[PDB]
Design a protein around this ligand. Structure first.
Ligand SMILES: O=C(O)c1ccc(O)c2ncccc12
Ligand SMILES: O=C(O)c1ccc(O)c2ncccc12
Ligand SMILES: [Zn+2]
Ligand SMILES: [Zn+2]
Lengths: 342, 342
């Protein structure tokens, strides 16, 4: 019906069959509806981006030259720089902010970061394959000037004309970075929101992206701002604790499967959960992050949900600073509302 | 024991008997301990005021010349100015901030203010006595320059030397006003806190003062800041709703009965409930309000409870302004803490 999820799997050209099938998606408790897949030249697509709603653009050629990328070509050409590689005991990658790690002395990491050369990432990977199992790796590394010449040529051949025009038309700030992501089949990036605009350019393999609007904050229960998992959902999507998180039962997502050549606009403050399909082999993505447009001169009501999220964050941070201890934030907030506003 | 309440009733000079007895106090659910009654010349008294804790000073002569005041002498001399007179259907006077009355269109007042000449206050009073019952009146009027000559002489003969030295030693701001209060026996001013320092100078009859420290905020459940009853306890002391207000069961007060010539220091942010004794006739009090000392240059931790109260107020006000509507404050606060900090 009007909940279709990712919709039917798309047919590859040349009668090559379905690129993926439903058996490759994980099972979750909530419904979803499709994110529209549109031509870059379609007015509707421009309309979505302007109104800060997700859209998959199928023909931008944004990273056309990178479509030839695989492990051998990258190992060959990407150079000798260090690469951040995250590892996990489970399919779920728990990212954490090392700087806030002191705020909760109690916190113990379930995801280790290791710096290593690209060829070492490739090896450890190969090792785990034949090994084999069960550790998972996810390379997540900003693209910098240490990259080899051929990678530089590829980068230069991205569709900067198109994306630069987007940046201009939306009044966004500057491109803050490109992130290279290379994951193992089954890898999951759990639901979280980012504060920057994102064009998610898919290169190799398929990723199922599940987005939730900023007005679903109440259903997704982010960690406290001072927590190392700031901006992530507390909810375990695999075993949701309806007692701690009752409104997760009301959550509705927007879902799509992106493949090579697709670009997903993930608007700032939109929650997103990203999974590399089961048994779909390695995945490669490059993200383009931009600072959002400056907040308007005179503020108009009613506020967007993302502005209320901003307010909440700011109150949290301010209490942390005023009280002199982030640990005291919750107890003051409780004192403030119990029998007064609840 | 170490909960004594007001303690034994004091013996009037000349074998005139107990000025009051326990039967004249209302019954409440919580325990109390006595506020110390000390000489103004006693170092301990200076110590309490400095550390912002209540003390009754028994010999300041602060309002010595006003000790002759009664209704006839005041009617005769206080002049022709208008006087604010509050009226109530019950013994409890519900004060409300008329300016915030728009914030809650739902709110309907249970306490009317009426302006009238002093002689009219005296008459309406007399009327109710013979009438008689059941309306209650409470005259509460700032002392201004419209007062007759004799009242001016009395005012000038207050002990300004003593109180001016207090103001100086505590580094307080300026005297912002003197309030004249004349109540009917049984009148109650319900628990609330003020943001200024207060010397409560008793003149005629007896008032039982029950104070709670600022760290009992969690037990006293003030109204939302934007509510017309801002700074008052939501709890009905006569029928406390332990379901809405469970921590009221943990509340402990400091209690005293003040009579003619006594001065009670009520420190800023300290809750206080004030009742004119049952069957003790008319009561007269003058309050002296001062702005507290400026907040210290470099803030030190740990914070005093009154500073956390200030923080909470400020967060409440800020949300009201940011959201554009005070009605939205509670729902945002709930969204902020549910499943996150509780
Ligand atoms: O792994 C991904 O596909 C991904 C996509 C979009 C994001 O905003 C991310 N943020 C942190 C880690 C991974 C991601
Ligand atoms: O009525 C009183 O005795 C009284 C004493 C101290 C206060 O701070 C008050 N504030 C508002 C109304 C009355 C009072
Ligand atoms: Zn992210
Ligand atoms: Zn008051």
């Amino acid at each position: 019906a009007v909940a279709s999820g990712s919709g039917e799997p798309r047919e590859e050209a040349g009668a090559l069959g379905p690129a993926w099938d439903e058996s490759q998606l994980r099972s979750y408790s909530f419904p979803t509806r499709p994110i529209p897949r549109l031509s870059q030249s379609d007015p509707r697509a421009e309309e979505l981006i302007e109104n800060e709603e997700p859209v998959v653009l199928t023909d931008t050629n944004l990273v056309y030259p990178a479509l030839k990328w695989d492990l051998e070509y990258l190992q060959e050409n990407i150079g000798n720089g260090d690469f951040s590689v995250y590892s996990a005991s489970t399919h779920k990658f728990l990212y954490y902010d090392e700087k806030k790690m002191a705020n909760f002395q109690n916190f113990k990491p379930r995801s280790n970061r290791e710096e290593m050369k690209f060829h070492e990432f490739v090896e450890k990977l190969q090792d785990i394959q034949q090994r084999g199992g069960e550790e998972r790796l996810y390379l997540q590394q900003t693209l910098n000037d240490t990259v080899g010449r051929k990678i530089v040529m590829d980068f230069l051949g991205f569709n900067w004309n198109w994306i630069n025009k987007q940046q201009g038309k939306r009044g966004w700030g500057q491109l803050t970075s490109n992130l290279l992501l290379i994951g193992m089949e089954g890898n999951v990036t759990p639901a979280h929101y980012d504060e920057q605009q994102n064009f998610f350019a898919q290169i190799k393999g398929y990723k199922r992206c599940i987005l939730f609007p900023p007005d679903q904050f109440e259903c997704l229960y982010p960690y406290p701002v001072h927590h190392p998992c700031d901006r992530q959902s507390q909810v375990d999507f695999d075993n949701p604790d309806y007692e701690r998180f009752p409104n997760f039962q009301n959550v509705v997502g927007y879902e799509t499967v992106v493949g090579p050549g697709d670009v997903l606009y993930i608007p700032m403050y939109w929650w997103h959960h990203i999974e590399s399909l089961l048994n779909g082999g390695i995945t490669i993505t490059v993200n383009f992050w931009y600072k959002g447009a400056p907040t308007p001169k005179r503020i108009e009501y009613p506020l967007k949900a993302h502005q209320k999220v901003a307010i909440m964050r700011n109150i949290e941070k301010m209490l942390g600073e005023a009280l002199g201890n982030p640990q005291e934030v919750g107890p003051l907030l409780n004192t403030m509302i119990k029998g007064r506003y609840n």
